[PDB]
């Protein structure tokens, strides 16, 4: 289609990954260090784990920062945590209905 | 863990210009099979929006609404910055 459609398409298709929402989540949570995100539920290694937190910095989702001999990573805007509430509630609504 | 594959296929639906396109015409008005800017195989990827939950045609639920708008204003914020 349009060019500027291509981009919303591809915004999503950055969320559609089960580490990446895992990520999210986490971040939304509490700010996670690298060594925090490294020894969580995600299972990624460190490479996989700087791959896939690379491009969610590049798409604005994640911002990081350094503490001292560390980089604390934390969701960009409050804005990131409402997408997420709102797309679990719709993600609740739809399953409720699939099932019953 | 079969959860967290649900909520990637939530928004791997959504990843589709063609999709997104239908969701915008659905949420301002309630458009007919002949009304539906896409430019469309049709039938195909209107299907898969009936099954995911988000199309009943029109809109299912104005909790998707708010998530389009919310889409929207996310995706504004970042190409303000990216760019």
């Given at each position: 289609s349009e060019p500027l459609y291509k981009l919303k398409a591809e915004f999503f298709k950055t969320l559609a990954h089960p580490a990446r929402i895992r990520i999210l989540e986490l971040l939304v949570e509490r700010d996670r260090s690298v060594g925090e995100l490294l020894s969580?539920?995600?299972?990624?290694?460190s490479s996989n784990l700087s791959q896939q937190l690379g491009v969610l910095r590049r798409a604005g989702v994640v911002a990081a920062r350094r503490d001292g001999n560390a980089m604390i990573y934390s969701i960009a805007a409050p804005d990131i945590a409402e997408l997420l509430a709102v797309a679990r509630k719709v993600l609740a609504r739809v399953l409720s209905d699939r099932v019953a």
């Open positions: 969580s539920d995600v299972g990624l290694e």
